[PDB]
Design a protein around this ligand. Structure first.
Ligand code: GTP
Ligand code: MG
Ligand code: ZN
Ligand code: ZN
Lengths: 277, 1350, 49, 49, 79
DNA sequence: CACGTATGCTATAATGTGCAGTCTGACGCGG
DNA sequence: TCCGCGTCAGACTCGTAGGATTATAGCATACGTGA
């Protein structure tokens, strides 16, 4: 038994009849007029066309099956917007919609980071131009060389070629052998080591010790501002909500608490020692 | 955070939605420009949470000032970024999809449950054909497949009143509508009608599936996925490399596939698309889901841009690379270093040289903490900068911290527990670790570029674990055999050998010395050699009846050297131990003696002293390697020319067409094998005792002082086979095939090999080397399986209070006692009361550890055989008692409760195999005088006048004056005995004689030879010579045989002069010997024979190197409990044997016992010949047919002790062949784990009923409650299981999945709704908790009582 | 020494404070295992005490 | 392995019978493989790729 | 004690319990600053705990005794 | 409006696809 | 029940080094939020 998704689908499309021009006009007249059967038979008859055009747009992003579905969707738009009265054949018209829809879908799904169509198409013209340049310049083209050919800013080219960088799989093994990959080396810079986490504990606890070594009205406005002891991290003007109810006297008392604490760090042995980190 | 147990069950669509915090409806990861997550994308922050701690995306809410706030603008909750690894999402599937694990992972589960073949389901799934869900019209039945055209026929005719559907929808609806209850009872009713063997297995299987399904609360619908869960972003990360590049998990590409096709399907449904296109999209959706779950399962795995298969979810759990094996049972570990190792001979046994810069970095936080206590460092940042600057004061602090702090040294590979040992570190300037020489043995560490790993025990508990349990001084004895592993090697042995060994007179022969100190004074002064014979006076200290030592002064005749070594010797040991010329073998006995008399401290210091003096004298000796040291035999060229004329004689006899190619091959190989022995013997007599030029009187003989010989004889280095290719002849080399080449090696290394000899050497060499790299995988895999099956076993109790054990005997294999009874029962809890031979007084107590004392007494009383308490016979449930195990071989005393024995056992069995990775038995010569005693023997006298044996397993004993077994041999089939049964023989007499390269078929009756079923071409072939024409007939087997003569058995029938058959004396059996395949026959049809003539000669090709490449598969097949290819037949029950009826030669057996009077019949193949002769009182398990024994049959008929002892002995045969000591108790551990499960045949008072297989522990605990309550008792039968299946049979599914077969294990557990309450070590190691054993047993039992009391 | 994120920092602080106290928790790899199993569509939940 | 032809045989494929099945293999530099092989019943078979 | 632990093991018996008992005692000296019985002779808390066990001064049962003694006297003081 | 992202049309006829390289002994499961 | 395709594992730590590739027409009008 053939269980291949592809082979099964291609079997089913084969068993629908190819249409002639007069048949296409007859069906399509009723199809625009809303005939469930007409649209279906035109679709089912012309699926084979979709697949033939789907075998040229491979090795680019998605697989044949994927392309075959987007192609089908293009053919559906073509059946909806076909003009039977116009002498022009259907296959000619459908080809445009199928190629269009396939190209456009391979431009949004082909890249892990969704690049907008417009950036992608801009970049594409830069690429095709680079190919012509390389065909007569023997050597591949520089950023300025591409920019010189299009009469455009070098920064435009640089930024457009800076969005072409591809994604590397985290799980892809290094050295060929399936052992340690980029995940086994890639260090989390968001998660710090116990050395750094413990330094923060020591730092935060240090201040507290010398925070209760100052004045009673110097550590009741300095901490209630930073949100160290208090509940909410206020600003100079917001400390008035507590009891201070001042704007200049709060700013004088904040900095007076800081200045006596600067001398507490200079005597214990920090100041410039704890400045580097 | 701390839970008790873990459950797996089927994920309901609704359950999947519970975990999800949002539906992903877009393939978008992040924006190209602002690298921020895209709306409803795979990395959506609106779903999975904030990228930065307490920060919304658009940045409206920052810091803890806004705690639980949900930004109206961007729609992101302001919380910890930690949540992005925690929160899951989901996808709504437009068409349902099969869960590949519960479809393709066998058993089918979805197919088994619907009773629908897998092919049938798939044809439905890929929309090839319709399946009927309910045909109300019984005209069409349930689950019947209809093709596209079959559906069109019934559609007009019946229609409406039949519902048949297609794809996942159909199967899900079929699953949903199926009533498990009703079908369960229906199938139980069908089970009763006519239950054939395989029908009843499949029916019981579906019964257990239905019962488990209702008990799990799983519903069949859930096999089909309507909702698809999404793994958290940080568990499938998209991270930016330094270079502006991005790198992502493959899961994100697979997720993108699924989403694109699913959303396209939603579109095609909104657009009312024609059905063929709908179908293709539904197939595409199932393909992408299947790729996402388990990629390379269903067909072609979906590859990416790397042209490699995209790592699927299943792949991250599955195999070595999977979560269990790589990240959960083993880890990268902080406070770890590695460097080259080199010798530290100055080190004491408890020490290791630790590089300064290495130690400075390993103990960083301890230095910062001490720096703040001294007030040298103001803060941590200042401490950091002070250590970066490496200030003078920082070294003095580091010195302070590392004192009394143990560090772990580890060497790869870690095969046994001693691969890791703790030392006190000694800081050294220089980047290499210095290792103590005496423990190099444990590590197998040679400094040819070896590196080691350093680990810092951080906690006080870990430090004490290192100092007490893992310290090198505390771990001397191998846990595998009761032998000290810490034993001088190499230079050390050579030095002590040099000192002790004597020379003729030399400087100061026959001097008289006051103390060993005067001797040292004399030697170093240069008026005495170390080898001078001298009458010194040394005072030895012998232990008395109590702990008090009795000293005794006496004048012995020893060398100066021996006197000086006595100074190293502790007081308490005898002088006679050092008074011999010391080798590696004597020095180990020295250490053993020291350990048993003095104890740990004295042995540790003594071992160090021995190392120092050993090296010291080795260097003084100035020993070296000259070209004159390699002495060759003066008679090489003669022996070789002779052996060469001999081989030429057999080549000439071949050219004459008489001797076959195979016979010449064997005889040429035998000539050269003997030539090799003779040349080696010649070299070694010429070398060993070559010092025949002495003085004093005249010409005297003494041992040669050749450096090379000394090295071999001391056992420092080299051997007798190493000197063969150093002065004698290289010998024969065997190919990478295993086979030996016809042309061997004649020249040695000294003489120098040519282009041909060297090229020929290569094959065997490279085969050896490739074996090392490739086979260690298989040895290690066996270690792994062993360890996995013995994991859980721990010492649980002190005394099980059982009377049970196994009666052991002395192994007398050959002429030298391979394993004595004393050594096989040393430190084993004796059972019952085992006294001396004369039964009239007790000798040993019931519950008593076997000490060296009681073992010595056993030998003086000559105890034959003794019941000893074993692990297998322990009654302790969920472990074993200290009594049933006996001595911890590594400790030298009774095992401590809590010690993890199983792991030790599996490591001990596995390591030797992993590390380790002349058959001319013509005639037995008896050596001591005795009466010949045969057993299991049926012989017959021949024409010549010689007792020829016609039984396969004949044994030959050697009975002394009083009547006990001294020597034992294996006499094979068709062997010629010198004297029969009961006759006396003298010493050095050939008692038995036979041809080794042949297995003869010998007759029991006289007359003429008849050819039956020996047609030329079909069964046999024919080949003639010349002038006269001697033709030989060669029997073809099923390999070289046509389809014509397949059921024809070829046999040489015996007949008389008339032409009639000749009955075998005392049986109704016409004489007919069936010849097997490749059997060469010299006598043709119509030839007269007497009784004892050889009818045919079966070839015996097996010229392998054995080694460890052909023994381990035997051991693995034993531990995996594989029934052999032609298993022997055994009596099931005791009684009287009766022969009955025959189906054209096929033997029926109508056996009628005494009490069980009902007859029992058994069919036997026609050509299989029985060794026993009917009409006999048969014990359960009397061998009837020649062949290997299946461990299952052994257990089923002769019970546990029988099968345990079969495996122990058959395994031990292999390791003993290689000179590997492993105690039986380790193999007995693993055996016990093999006998874990038991099948209940007949209902109890619980819900066991017929055929359930449960742990024997749990059914015995049930039987304790039945004994008290009465009710219906449970009848059961113990079952044997192979290691792999036994490990999978443990109730713990975490243990099962971590081992192997992970996809299948988790489907089985998920469908059963299994809950693991975590009792084993594996399971606790995985969750990163405290081991339930060793140190952890205290805490873990304290938890168990907290659990028992709420 | 390995995954336990709370444990390693807390342990570090204990070492600098001299007290070699063991303050362990759960390895982060196990948490991941569970999430990976549920992403496979197998419900694996922890029954608490 | 050189393009050309090659005659091989698994010495006892089915370990039950132990019958030597001879096979031929045509290896091109570019194209499909052409295999000829015996079965136990001594019937000649052809397989492509 | 430092080099060889055998005599210390022979006092308690169970190696595993020796480790637990010496760890609990070493934690007392490490954190509580509980005073040593044996002269430290410049040794770490770990070594002191093992020496104390070798001479037979520290014991699981004795530790539990002094635990309730001091805890009960503090309960007496509270009430 | 601009800037980013999307939807759309053009009409000679064209209508079934196209990479695999074999390892080995063992243990189960439908024909 | 036998021949036969399918599944299942196949030692433990070290290491060296990054990674590279392809290509999606050209233009006019349409839809969603900041300045
Ligand atoms: N795990 C592992 N170990 C290896 C490998 N190759 C060599 N070794 C080890 O390195 C050592 C090299 O052989 P030696 O150690 O010299 O052999 P030996 O036991 O000293 O025996 P003699 O040479 O007779 O003295 C062995 O102990 C091996 O265990 C390998 O590929 N894997
Ligand atoms: Mg080495
Ligand atoms: Zn926001
Ligand atoms: Zn017991």
């Amino acid at each position: 038994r053939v269980l291949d998704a592809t082979q099964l689908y291609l079997g089913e499309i084969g068993y629908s009849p190819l249409l002639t021009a007069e048949e296409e006009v007859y069906f399509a007249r009723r199809a625009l007029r809303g005939d469930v059967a007409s649209r279906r038979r035109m679709i089912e008859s012309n699926l084979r066309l979709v697949v033939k055009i789907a075998r040229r747009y491979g090795n680019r992003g998605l697989a044949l099956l994927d392309l075959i579905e987007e192609g089908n969707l293009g053919l559906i738009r073509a059946v909806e917007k076909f003009d039977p009265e116009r002498g022009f054949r259907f296959s000619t018209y459908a080809t445009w919609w199928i190629r269009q829809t396939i190209e456009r879908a391979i431009m949004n799904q082909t890249r892990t980071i969704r690049l907008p169509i417009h950036i992608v198409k801009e970049l594409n013209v830069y690429l095709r131009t680079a190919r012509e340049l390389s065909h007569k310049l023997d050597h591949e083209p520089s950023a300025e060389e591409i920019a010189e050919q299009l009469d455009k800013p070098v920064d435009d080219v640089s930024r457009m070629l800076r969005l072409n960088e591809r994604i590397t799989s985290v799980d892809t093994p290094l050295g060929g052998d399936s052992e340690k990959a980029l995940l086994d080396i890639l260090a989390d810079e968001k998660e710090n080591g116990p050395e750094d986490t413990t330094q923060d504990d020591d730092m935060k606890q240090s201040i507290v010790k010398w925070l209760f070594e100052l004045n009673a009205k110097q550590r009741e406005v300095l901490a209630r501002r930073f949100g160290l002891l208090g509940y909410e991290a206020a600003t100079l003007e917001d400390v008035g909500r507590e009891i201070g109810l001042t704007r200049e006297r709060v700013r004088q008392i904040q900095v007076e608490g800081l200045r006596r604490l600067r001398e507490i760090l200079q005597t214990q042995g920090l100041n410039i020692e704890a400045l580097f980190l | 955070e701390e839970f008790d147990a873990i459950k797996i069950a089927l994920a309901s669509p609704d359950m999947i939605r519970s975990w999800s915090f949002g539906e992903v409806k877009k393939p978008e990861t992040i924006n190209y420009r602002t690298f921020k997550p895209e709306r409803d994308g795979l990395f959506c922050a609106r779903i999975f949470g904030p990228v930065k701690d307490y920060e919304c995306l658009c940045g409206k809410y920052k810091r803890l000032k806004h705690r639980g706030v949900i930004c109206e603008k961007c729609g992101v909750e302001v919380t910890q970024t930690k949540v992005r690894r925690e929160r899951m999402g989901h996808i709504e599937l437009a068409s349902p999809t099969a869960h590949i694990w519960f479809l393709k992972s066998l058993p089918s589960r979805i197919g088994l449950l619907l009773d629908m073949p897998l092919r049938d389901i798939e044809r439905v799934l890929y929309f090839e054909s319709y399946v009927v869900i309910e045909g109300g019209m019984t005209n069409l039945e349930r689950q019947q497949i209809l093709t596209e055209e079959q559906y069109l026929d019934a559609l007009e005719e019946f229609g409406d009143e039949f519902d048949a559907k297609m794809g996942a929808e159909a199967i899900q609806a079929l699953l949903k509508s199926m009533d498990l209850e009703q079908e369960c009872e229906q199938l139980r009713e069908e089970l009763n009608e006519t239950n054939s063997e395989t029908k009843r297995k499949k029916l019981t299987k579906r019964i257990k599936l239905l019962e488990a399904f209702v008990q799990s609360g799983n519903k069949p619908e859930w096999m089909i996925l309507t909702v698809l869960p999404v793994l958290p972003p940080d568990l499938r990360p998209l991270v930016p490399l330094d270079g502006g590049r991005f790198a992502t998990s493959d899961l994100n590409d697979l997720y993108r596939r699924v989403i694109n096709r699913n959303n396209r399907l939603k579109r095609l449904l909104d657009l009312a698309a024609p059905d063929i296109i709908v179908r293709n999209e539904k197939r595409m959706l199932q393909e992408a889901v299947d790729a996402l779950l388990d990629n390379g399962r269903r067909g072609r795995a979906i590859t990416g841009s790397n042209k490699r298969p995209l790592k699927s979810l299943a792949d991250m759990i599955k195999g070595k690379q999977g979560r269990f094996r790589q990240n959960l049972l083993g880890k990268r570990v902080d406070y770890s270093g590695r460097s080259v190792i080199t010798v530290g001979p100055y080190l004491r046994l408890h020490q290791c040289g630790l590089p300064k810069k290495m130690a400075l970095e390993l103990f960083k936080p301890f230095i910062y903490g001490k720096l703040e206590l001294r007030g040298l460092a103001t803060t941590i940042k200042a401490a950091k900068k002070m250590v970066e600057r490496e200030e003078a004061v920082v070294w003095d602090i580091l010195d302070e911290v590392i004192r009394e702090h143990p560090v772990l040294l580890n060497r790869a590979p870690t095969l046994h527990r001693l691969g890791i040992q703790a030392f006190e570190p000694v800081l050294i300037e220089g980047k290499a670790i210095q290792l103590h020489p005496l423990v190099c043995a444990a590590y197998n560490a040679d400094f040819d570029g070896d590196q080691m790993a350093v680990h810092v025990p951080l906690t006080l508990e870990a430090q004490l674990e290192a100092r007490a349990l893992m310290m090198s001084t505390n771990n001397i004895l191998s846990p595998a055999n009761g032998e000290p592993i810490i034993v001088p090697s190499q230079d050390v042995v050579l030095g002590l050998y040099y000192m002790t060994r004597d020379c003729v007179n030399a400087k100061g022969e026959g001097m008289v010395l006051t103390g060993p100190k005067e001797a040292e004074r004399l030697y170093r002064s240069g008026l005495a050699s170390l080898h001078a014979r001298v009458k010194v006076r040394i005072t030895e200290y012998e232990k008395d009846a109590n702990g008090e030592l009795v000293a005794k002064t006496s004048l012995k005749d020893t060398t100066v050297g021996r006197a000086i070594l006595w100074m190293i010797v502790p007081k308490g040991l005898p002088y006679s131990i050092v008074n011999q010329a010391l080798g590696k073998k004597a020095i180990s006995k020295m250490l053993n003696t020291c350990y048993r008399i003095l104890g740990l401290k004295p042995t540790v210091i003594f071992a160090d002293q021995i190392m120092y003096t050993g090296f010291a004298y080795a260097a003084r000796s100035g020993a070296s390697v000259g070209i004159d040291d390699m002495v060759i035999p003066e008679k090489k060229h003669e022996i070789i020319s002779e052996a060469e004329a001999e081989v030429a004689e057999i080549q000439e006899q071949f050219q004459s067409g008489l001797v076959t190619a195979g016979e010449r091959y064997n005889k040429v190989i035998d000539i050269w094998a003997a030539a090799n022995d003779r040349v080696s013997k010649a070299m070694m007599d010429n070398l060993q005792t070559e010092t025949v030029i002495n003085r004093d009187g005249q010409e005297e003989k003494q041992v040669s002082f050749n450096s090379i010989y000394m090295m071999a004889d001391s056992g420092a280095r080299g051997s007798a086979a190493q000197i063969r290719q150093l002065a004698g002849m290289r010998g024969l080399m065997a190919k990478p095939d295993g086979s030996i080449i016809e042309t061997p090696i004649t020249a040695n290394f000294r003489e120098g090999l040519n282009v041909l000899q060297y090229f020929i050497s290569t094959h065997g060499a490279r085969k050896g080397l490739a074996d090392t790299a490739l086979k260690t995988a298989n040895s290690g895999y066996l270690t792994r399986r062993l360890v996995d099956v013995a994991q859980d076993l721990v010492v649980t109790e002190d005394d099980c209070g059982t009377h049970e054990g196994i009666m052991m005997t002395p192994v007398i294999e050959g002429g030298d006692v391979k394993e004595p009874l004393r050594d096989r029962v040393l430190g084993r809890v004796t059972a019952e009361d085992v006294l001396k031979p004369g039964t009239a007084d007790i000798l040993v107590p019931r519950n008593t550890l076997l000490h060296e004392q009681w073992c010595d007494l056993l030998e003086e009383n000559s105890v034959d055989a003794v019941k000893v308490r074993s692990v297998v016979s322990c009654d302790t449930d969920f472990g074993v008692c200290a009594h049933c195990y006996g001595r911890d071989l590594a400790r030298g005393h009774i095992i401590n409760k809590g010690e993890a024995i199983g792991v030790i056992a599996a490591q001990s069995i596995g390591e030797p195999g992993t590390q380790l990775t002349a058959a001319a038995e013509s005639s037995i010569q008896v050596k001591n005088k005795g009466s010949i005693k045969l057993s299991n023997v049926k012989s017959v006298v021949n024409s010549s006048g010689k007792l020829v044996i016609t039984s396969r397993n004949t044994e030959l004993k050697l009975i002394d004056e009083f009547g006990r077994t001294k020597e034992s041999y294996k006499v094979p089939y068709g062997a010629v005995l010198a004297k029969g049964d009961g006759e006396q023989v003298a010493g050095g007499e050939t008692v038995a004689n036979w041809d080794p390269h042949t297995m003869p078929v010998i007759t029991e009756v006289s007359g003429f030879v008849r050819f039956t079923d020996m047609i030329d071409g079909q069964t046999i072939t024919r080949q003639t010579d010349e002038l006269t024409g001697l033709s030989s007939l060669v029997v073809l087997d099923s390999a070289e045989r046509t389809a014509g003569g397949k059921d024809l058995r070829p046999a040489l029938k015996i007949v008389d002069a008339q032409g009639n058959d000749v009955l075998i004396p005392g049986t109704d059996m016409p004489a007919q010997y069936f010849l097997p395949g490749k059997a060469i026959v010299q006598l043709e049809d119509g030839v007269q024979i007497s009784s004892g003539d050889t009818l045919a000669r079966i070839p015996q090709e097996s010229g392998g190197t054995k080694d460890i490449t052909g023994g381990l598969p035997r051991v693995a097949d034993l531990f995996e409990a594989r029934r052999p290819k032609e298993p022997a037949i055994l009596a099931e029950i005791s009684g009287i044997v009766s022969f009955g009826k025959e189906t054209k030669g096929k033997r029926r057996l109508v056996i009628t016992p005494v009490d069980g009077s009902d007859p029992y019949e058994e069919m036997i193949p026609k050509w299989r010949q029985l060794n026993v002769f009917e009409g006999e009182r048969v014990e359960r398990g009397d061998v009837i047919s020649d062949g290997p024994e299946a461990p299952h049959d052994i257990l089923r008929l002769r019970g546990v002790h029988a099968v345990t002892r079969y495996i122990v002995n058959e395994v031990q045969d292999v390791y003993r062949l290689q000179g590997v000591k492993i105690n039986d108790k380790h193999i007995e551990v693993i055996v016990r784990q093999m006998l874990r499960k038991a099948t209940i045949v007949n209902a109890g008072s619980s819900d066991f009923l017929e055929g359930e297989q449960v742990e024997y522990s749990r059914v015995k605990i049930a039987n304790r409650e039945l004994e008290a309550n009465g009710k219906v008792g449970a009848t059961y039968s113990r079952d044997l299981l192979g290691i792999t299946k036994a490990s999978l049979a443990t109730e713990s599914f975490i243990s099962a999945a971590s081992f192997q077969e992970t996809t299948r294990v988790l489907t089985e557990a998920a469908v059963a709704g299994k809950r693991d309450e975590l009792r084993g070590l594996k399971e606790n190691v995985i969750v990163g908790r405290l081991i339930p054993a060793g140190t952890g047993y205290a805490y873990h039992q304290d938890r168990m009582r907290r659990r028992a009391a709420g | 020494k390995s995954d336990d994120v709370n444990g390693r920092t807390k342990m570090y602080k204990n070492i600098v404070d001299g007290n070699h106290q063991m303050e362990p928790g759960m390895p982060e790899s196990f948490n991941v295992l569970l999430k990976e199993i549920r992403s496979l569509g197998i419900n694996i939940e922890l029954e608490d005490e | 392995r050189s393009p050309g032809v090659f005659f091989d045989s698994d010495k006892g494929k089915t370990h039950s019978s132990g019958k030597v099945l001879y096979n031929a293999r045509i290896i091109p530099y570019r194209g499909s493989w052409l295999d000829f092989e015996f079965d136990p019943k001594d019937n000649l078979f052809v397989r492509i790729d | 004690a430092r080099v060889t632990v055998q005599d210390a093991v022979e006092k308690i018996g169970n190696r595993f319990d020796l480790v637990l008992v010496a760890a609990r005692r070493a934690r007392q000296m490490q954190v509580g600053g509980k005073d040593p019985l044996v002269p430290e002779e410049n040794d770490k808390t770990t070594v002191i705990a093992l020496r104390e066990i070798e001479e037979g001064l520290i014991n699981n049962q004795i530790l539990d005794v002094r635990e309730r003694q001091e805890q009960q006297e503090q309960e007496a003081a509270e009430l």
